[PDB]
Amino acid sequence: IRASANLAATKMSECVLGQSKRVDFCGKGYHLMSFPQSAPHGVVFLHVT
Amino acid sequence: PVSMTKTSVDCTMYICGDSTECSNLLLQYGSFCTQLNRALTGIAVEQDKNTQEVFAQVKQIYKTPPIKDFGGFNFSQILPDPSKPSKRSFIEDLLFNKVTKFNGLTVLPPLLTDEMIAQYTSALLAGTITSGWTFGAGAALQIPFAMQMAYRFNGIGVTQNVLYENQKLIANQFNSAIGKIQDSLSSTASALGKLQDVVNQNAQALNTLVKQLSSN
Amino acid sequence: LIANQFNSAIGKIQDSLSSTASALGKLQDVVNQNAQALNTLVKQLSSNFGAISSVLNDILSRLDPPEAEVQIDRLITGRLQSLQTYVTQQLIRAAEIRASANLAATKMSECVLGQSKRVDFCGKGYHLMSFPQSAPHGVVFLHVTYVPAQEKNFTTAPAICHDGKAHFPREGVFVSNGTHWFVTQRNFYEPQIITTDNTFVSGNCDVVIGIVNNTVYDPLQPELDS
Amino acid sequence: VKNKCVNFNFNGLTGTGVLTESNKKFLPFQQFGRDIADTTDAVRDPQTLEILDITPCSFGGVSVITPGTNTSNQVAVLYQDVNCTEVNVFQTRAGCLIGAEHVNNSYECDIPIGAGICASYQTSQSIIAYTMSLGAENSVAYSNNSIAIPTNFTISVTTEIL
Numbered sequence: 001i002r003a004s005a006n007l008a009a010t011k012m013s014e015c016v017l018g019q020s021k022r023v024d025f026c027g028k029g030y031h032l033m034s035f036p037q038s039a040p041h042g043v044v045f046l047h048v049t
Numbered sequence: 050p051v052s053m054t055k056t057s058v059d060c061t062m063y064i065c066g067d068s069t070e071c072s073n074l075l076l077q078y079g080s081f082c083t084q085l086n087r088a089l090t091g092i093a094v095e096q097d098k099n100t101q102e103v104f105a106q107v108k109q110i111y112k113t114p115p116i117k118d119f120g121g122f123n124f125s126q127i128l129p130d131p132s133k134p135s136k137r138s139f140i141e142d143l144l145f146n147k148v149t150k151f152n153g154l155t156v157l158p159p160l161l162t163d164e165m166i167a168q169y170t171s172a173l174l175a176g177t178i179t180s181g182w183t184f185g186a187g188a189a190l191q192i193p194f195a196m197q198m199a200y201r202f203n204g205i206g207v208t209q210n211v212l213y214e215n216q217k218l219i220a221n222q223f224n225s226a227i228g229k230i231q232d233s234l235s236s237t238a239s240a241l242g243k244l245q246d247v248v249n250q251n252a253q254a255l256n257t258l259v260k261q262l263s264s265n
Numbered sequence: 266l267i268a269n270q271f272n273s274a275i276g277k278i279q280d281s282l283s284s285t286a287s288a289l290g291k292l293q294d295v296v297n298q299n300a301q302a303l304n305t306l307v308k309q310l311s312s313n314f315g316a317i318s319s320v321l322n323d324i325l326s327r328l329d330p331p332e333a334e335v336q337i338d339r340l341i342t343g344r345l346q347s348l349q350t351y352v353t354q355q356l357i358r359a360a361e362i363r364a365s366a367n368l369a370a371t372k373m374s375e376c377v378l379g380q381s382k383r384v385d386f387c388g389k390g391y392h393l394m395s396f397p398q399s400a401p402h403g404v405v406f407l408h409v410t411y412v413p414a415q416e417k418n419f420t421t422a423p424a425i426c427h428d429g430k431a432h433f434p435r436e437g438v439f440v441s442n443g444t445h446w447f448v449t450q451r452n453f454y455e456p457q458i459i460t461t462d463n464t465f466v467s468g469n470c471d472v473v474i475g476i477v478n479n480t481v482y483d484p485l486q487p488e489l490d491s
Numbered sequence: 492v493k494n495k496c497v498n499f500n501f502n503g504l505t506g507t508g509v510l511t512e513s514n515k516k517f518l519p520f521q522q523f524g525r526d527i528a529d530t531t532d533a534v535r536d537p538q539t540l541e542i543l544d545i546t547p548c549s550f551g552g553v554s555v556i557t558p559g560t561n562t563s564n565q566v567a568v569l570y571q572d573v574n575c576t577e578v579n580v581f582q583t584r585a586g587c588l589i590g591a592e593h594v595n596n597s598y599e600c601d602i603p604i605g606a607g608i609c610a611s612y613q614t615s616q617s618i619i620a621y622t623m624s625l626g627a628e629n630s631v632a633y634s635n636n637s638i639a640i641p642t643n644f645t646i647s648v649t650t651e652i653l
């Protein structure tokens with residue numbers, strides 16, 4: 001879980017908090033920006049590509 | 050997944066049903082479960098630390114402006130809606146409706162309750178919608194969202210021309226795309242598997258653990 | 266100003282490490298956790314584990330093998346289980362360390378060895394460079410980061426119409442201080458007068474929403490006029 | 492005797508619990524209830540035919556909220572996951588909290604109790620429990636035609652230790 005959570009924190013920083021040009025790290029296609037959404041014991045991302 | 054249910058299982062009450070003779074037997078084995086209790090406390094602190102690392106990455110809790118004039122786009126779905134009693138956006142309310150003992154098992158409450166977490170995800174969102182990356186990099190810098198898109202297109206190599214000339218079409222395409230995300234979560238539960246699997250695996254691990262008490 | 270501001274920032278690094286010990290919590294937690302694990306291991310050595318006496322030489326001396334074998338077996342099972350617990354704890358902690366080590370290896374290569382355009386992977390703010398410093402059973406990074414400081418109000422517009430043709434910026438933003446129109450770089454206020462060398466022409470006015478009317482200067486024109 | 496933490500032994504079952512009336516209806520033949528974990532939770536009173544629910548006696552973890560020994564010796568105690576009747580007593584969703592003063596003013600979290608409540612040592616000094624503050628609220632004056640361009644920079648060196 002902490003490996004996933006660190007992955008998520010990396011995503012939230014590089015994908016929500018910043019644009020990322022890393023391919024497929026933020027959903028298939030070129031990446032523009034992402035939205036965080038809370039969920040019970042997890043986070044769901046909306047990746048705009 | 051980000052965090053898992055914080056549970057604490059006490060060594061003495063759990064292993065021995067409040068028996069002094071049993072406790073004296075347990076102390077005979079020495080320091081096994083005092084490290085079990087400390088390690089399981091350590092498990093719990095990490096989960097809170099996780100939610101600190103993922104969400105609490107913003108120093109100031111921004112709020113969205115009242116009037117939703119966002120260059121023609123319709124972000125009203127992902128932004129907070131005042132009508133619902135908990136200050137939760139529509140898509141979180143869609144998940145929080147879609148997603149659904151006394152033998153030494155204690156469930157410690159999480160540090161960040163669901164409304165406060167929602168406040169972070171609102172702050173982080175309102176930061177994206179009014180600052181782009183700048184609020185993350187340093188102090189929050191105001192920017193109109195049309196330019197923020199033109200910045201981001203220039204990032205992916207498509208010049209700003211394509212944006213400004215085709216803004217209305219993308220507005221309709223994105224709004225319909227959000228609508229699809231609504232209907233896809235509202236009707237289909239296959240996508241939302243991973244959190245349910247985390248809950249199933251953990252709650253089963255506890256259910257097996259407590260079930261072991263009834264094994265001879 | 267950069268040279269002195271960086272030297273002062275190093276000075277604050279000096280003062281922060283020299284005075285505040287809360288920084289080294291993670292490495293101190295690793296060392297304390299490991300030493301406490303070994304200490305707990307020895308404490309389990311000197312624990313009876315449900316036998317007549319904790320000392321092997323004691324149980325050996327007092328009881329002969331035919332009955333003693335059960336007690337010795339109990340001490341073996343207790344110690345071996347304690348060693349199992351200790352090794353599994355060490356091995357898993359080694360795995361988390363390995364994950365941190367690999368994260369450090371990536372951070373070393375991608376941040377120290379080269380500049381990294383990744384945001385907040387190398388401390389908050391835009392990243393310039395990072396430096397390694399050795400430490401007992403760990404590495405300490407200094408992250409030299411660029412952070413914007415003082416804002417300034419400008420009115421803005423997506424594009425500029427000069428002769429009905431819409432002009433977009435190659436780099437930067439159209440900013441007006443209220444009475445004149447300038448182009449500025451995105452992360453620092455360096456106003457420049459609008460010219461055809463910083464802007465590329467495209468399309469016509471009608472399609473783009475929010476465009477303002479602004480004269481665009483052509484650097485070539487005064488050269489041909491003169 | 493009901494609604495009291497009593498050591499009980501019914502028909503020789505034995506154990507510790509809180510005897511309360513149970514709305515659950517036995518079929519006439521059944522005698523002993525049980526749980527998902529196969530432990531006794533419902534009993535039929537032998538002498539007189541009433542159905543009794545077994546609720547285990549209250550319990551919870553013991554956590555202390557303590558500031559630095561040099562700054563003072565005052566301490567406030569957290570009884571985990573018990574409501575404030577079994578025990579400046581403040582009731583929070585984490586559990587009953589004794590020896591702490593509630594304040595509606597909010598500050599940055601210093602000592603976390605859970606369910607959003609954090610403790611810190613402030614005014615003459617004492618231990619205060621408050622709803623934790625998320626950070627300084629800062630609405631941004633977002634507009635369709637307004638841009639903020641930084642005119643200055645600060646090169647801050649931050650230490651990250653792995």
Ligand SMILES: *[C@@H]1O[C@H](CO)[C@@H](O[C@@H]2O[C@H](CO)[C@@H](O)[C@H](O)[C@H]2NC(C)=O)[C@H](O)[C@H]1NC(C)=O
Pocket residue numbers: 118474475635636
């Ligand atoms: C920013 O939004 C405001 C409204 O909040 C705009 O003001 C009106 O905009 C409409 C559509 O452009 C015009 O028809 C009205 O004449 C405007 N009225 C006023 C009071 O100016 C404003 O034009 C918008 N600006 C930009 C850059 O789009």
Ligand SMILES: *[C@@H]1O[C@H](CO)[C@@H](O)[C@H](O)[C@H]1NC(C)=O
Pocket residue numbers: 416417418632637
């Ligand atoms: C820019 O204007 C906004 C309101 O329009 C104001 O809140 C902000 O302080 C201004 N910036 C400066 C540097 O004065």
Ligand SMILES: *[C@@H]1O[C@H](CO)[C@@H](O)[C@H](O)[C@H]1NC(C)=O
Pocket residue numbers: 426470475476477478
């Ligand atoms: C710029 O000029 C055109 C041509 O007259 C006009 O229609 C348009 O309204 C102008 N734009 C603004 C923002 O005044």
Ligand SMILES: *[C@@H]1O[C@H](CO)[C@@H](O)[C@H](O)[C@H]1NC(C)=O
Pocket residue numbers: 559560561562
């Ligand atoms: C006193 O000691 C505690 C820890 O024992 C520490 O947190 C606190 O800051 C110290 N206070 C002073 C004034 O040194």
Ligand SMILES: *[C@@H]1O[C@H](CO)[C@@H](O)[C@H](O)[C@H]1NC(C)=O
Pocket residue numbers: 574575576
């Ligand atoms: C705690 O006990 C009191 C006394 O009966 C009761 O009024 C209150 O509702 C209890 N709290 C909860 C959360 O049940």
Ligand SMILES: *[C@@H]1O[C@H](CO)[C@@H](O)[C@H](O)[C@H]1NC(C)=O
Pocket residue numbers: 593594595
């Ligand atoms: C806020 O202060 C008032 C008066 O000082 C008090 O009655 C009230 O209980 C406080 N709010 C909270 C949530 O404690």
